[PDB]
Amino acid sequence: YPTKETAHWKPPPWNDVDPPKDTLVSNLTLNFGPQHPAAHGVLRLVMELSG
């Protein structure tokens, strides 16, 4: 029984699966230097991590 308050309602997916479109951004990018600059000092490492 359609009403004005259910007009935007749509049938659910045929297989119950909704697309994953919200947030999936799990790769860190780390500008990596040395803990102590006594020896290396001039190393810049742009690393992309996954966990």
Binding site: H36, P37, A38, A39, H40, G41, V42
Partner: peptide, 14 residues
């Protein structure tokens, strides 16, 4: 100290 070891002089600092 915060040693900014940039080149050869860092060896003598070590």
């Amino acid at each position: 100290p915060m040693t900014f070891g940039l080149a050869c002089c860092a060896v003598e600092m070590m």
